């Protein structure tokens, strides 16, 4: 069958419902003092990143927001380049979780929990940055519409107030669509426990689920609606993290194709992180029969299909910067190609629209040592896109007497390099305590391969 030969590319060898539940219920329920190595040495490397995170924040609150190196021309720096980068990472974690669930696609099934959880920890690492880039961070509750004894409310015309409304909707429905997905899954880890103090842990995280058609029908009509509510959300969230440049009148910022080209770069940099995280989750956790290489052949095609929309984005915003007869957008082209930060835009054309244009060929998509180098050049490269958008439009602007430079200090590096600690502190807590693959959905994928072989 033409449909059966699609579903057999996702699993591979002989697999039943128990052999699928066993190989995901052995990543979890393998007890401590029996837990395999790699996870101890990574959870204490992430602790040194978290103690670089919590020290750079304890510095930041005490001495101030001006240990970063942000100038007065360029007053948004690594606090915002890494914030749009981290928000950009978790967005393709919900293209995998929500947008592909609209398309009834079955190759999103095993990539689900390693993208639902990867969204959340790229938002908990992100969402600290709108709370700590403010100079007075103890008043970020003033960006909330609450009644007080002041008659003051937030503005609701600024696109940083909508960043409050986008992320505090994005952070809460990421942890409500990943926890709803874990309601029928932690009921399976509960029944495979045979240890009552880890059975009560997964017997209370899963609320008491039982299966049941009156609960399974209510689950998926609350899942695809949630997958239909998280799909205009993430096309809006990283559009709302895109409006807080495009609302501003700056020459490199006030372009109107920022809302679809940022979210294209979010499902470009984000698929690069799912590829950068799942290639070391097959070689280290033996998931060669669930994360089979057709999942990377399709994650590479969607990363390619998203990397052309930002290849379109770099050429449109360099066309309409010339097509506008402004001297300020004529200068924008001659400040990304020339000028002091021309190396950033040429390490952007190389790392985004030259090196991952090998994604057309299957030779650099099925080969994981080539898909890893391509995706590692997107995380470095899409950081440089958000550097070119933010810094190169800020550090040289309308008036020549306000031209700055923004060379970052150590506390801009230590907060960003410390932010990967808080990602992998929680990711390695997710791998150990929770399943990395949604067991009940891949049980349906095993059931879907059997029900199409029985149609012969």
């Amino acid at each position: 069958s033409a449909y059966g030969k699609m579903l057999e590319e996702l699993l591979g060898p002989k697999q039943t419902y128990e052999s699928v539940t066993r190989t995901i219920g052995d990543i979890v329920l393998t007890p401590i003092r029996k837990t395999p190595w790699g996870w101890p040495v990574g959870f204490v490397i992430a602790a040194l990143g978290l103690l670089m995170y919590l020290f750079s924040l304890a510095v930041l609150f005490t001495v101030g927001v001006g240990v970063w190196g942000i100038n007065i021309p360029v007053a948004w720096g690594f606090d915002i380049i890494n914030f749009v980068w981290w928000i950009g990472i978790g967005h393709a974690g919900t293209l995998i979780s929500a947008i592909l669930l609209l398309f009834r696609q079955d190759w999103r099934t095993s990539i689900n929990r390693a993208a639902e959880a990867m969204t959340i920890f790229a938002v908990a690492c992100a969402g600290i940055y709108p709370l700590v880039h403010t100079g007075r961070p103890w008043l970020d509750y003033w960006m909330l519409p609450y009644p007080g004894t002041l008659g003051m409310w937030p503005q609701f015309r600024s696109a940083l107030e909508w960043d409050v409304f986008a992320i505090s909707t994005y952070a809460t429905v990421s942890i409500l669509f990943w926890y709803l997905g874990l309601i029928p899954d932690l009921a399976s880890l509960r029944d495979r426990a045979t240890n009552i103090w880890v059975k009560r842990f997964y017997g209370f995280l899963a609320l008491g689920w039982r299966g049941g058609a009156r609960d399974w029908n209510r689950y998926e009509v609350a899942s695809l609606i949630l997958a239909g509510l998280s799909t205009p959300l993430v096309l809006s969230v990283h559009s709302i993290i895109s409006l807080d440049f495009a609302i501003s009148q700056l020459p490199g910022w006030h372009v109107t194709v920022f809302p679809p080209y940022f979210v294209a770069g979010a499902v470009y940099c984000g698929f690069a992180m799912v590829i950068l995280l799942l290639v070391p989750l097959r070689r280290w956790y033996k998931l060669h029969d669930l994360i089979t290489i057709k999942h990377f052949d399709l994650m590479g095609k969607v990363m390619l299909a998203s990397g052309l929309v930002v290849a379109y984005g770099y050429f449109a915003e360099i066309f309409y910067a010339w097509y506008s007869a402004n001297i300020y957008e004529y200068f924008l082209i001659t400040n990304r190609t020339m000028g002091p930060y021309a190396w950033s835009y040429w390490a952007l054309i190389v790392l985004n629209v030259a090196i991952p244009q090998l994604l057309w060929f299957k030779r650099f998509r099925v080969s994981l040592p080539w898909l890893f180098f391509i995706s590692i050049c997107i995380n470095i490269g899409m950081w440089f896109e958000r550097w070119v958008i933010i810094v190169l439009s800020l550090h040289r602007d309308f008036l020549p007497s306000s031209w700055g430079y923004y060379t970052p200090s150590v506390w801009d590096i230590s907060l960003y390099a410390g932010s990967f600690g808080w990602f992998f502190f929680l990711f390695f807590l997710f791998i150990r305590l929770l399943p990395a693959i949604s067991i009940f959905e891949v049980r349906d994928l095993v059931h879907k391969t059997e029900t199409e072989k029985a149609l012969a």
Partner: protein, 170 residues
């Protein structure tokens, strides 16, 4: 009622910088040390801009006295999440310091970049280096007398702006 505007005759400005230092003495503007001027964090509500038009050996040098232009359709105001930058009905731009949470987005949308952020605790900076919090909320007692009692002596993370000397307007 009381539409406030300003006319700066650029033909007669000799770049004497007496208006930079009189905004400093009137509006309690903090001095910033040499290490944080090189990072472009000088606190100066008004600035004079040389521009050097012509041949690189005999040029014409032109001054633009660039202060907060108090824009009617002010782009610095629409990008303030907590509305810490609004207008009067008198027409001038009100930068209220106690509401500023410190999101430097107003400075980015200000096209003239006449917004000036307190980055560290800029207070008595040539007498204590501003990279400590051992004396952040402790101030020199004799320097408190030079401050104008009608202008907010600003905190660590709020933004400044030329307020048309609104304490002299009011």
């Amino acid at each position: 009622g009381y539409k406030w505007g300003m006319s700066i005759d650029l033909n007669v400005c000799n770049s004497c910088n007496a208006c930079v230092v009189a905004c400093q003495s009137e509006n309690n503007i903090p001095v910033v040390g040499k290490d944080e001027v090189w990072l472009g964090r000088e606190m100066h509500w008004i600035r004079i801009d040389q521009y050097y038009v012509g041949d690189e050996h005999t040029p014409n040098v032109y001054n633009m006295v660039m202060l907060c232009q108090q824009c009617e359709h002010a782009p610095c105001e629409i990008v303030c999440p907590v509305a810490a930058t609004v207008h009067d009905a008198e027409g001038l731009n009100n930068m209220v310091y106690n509401r500023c949470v410190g999101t430097k987005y107003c400075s980015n949308n200000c096209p003239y970049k006449v917004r000036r952020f307190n980055f560290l605790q800029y207070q008595d900076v040539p007498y204590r280096s501003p990279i400590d919090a051992s004396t952040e909320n402790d101030s020199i007692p004799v320097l408190k007398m030079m401050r104008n009692p009608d202008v907010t002596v600003r905190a660590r993370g709020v933004m400044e702006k030329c307020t048309f000397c609104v304490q002299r307007i009011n």
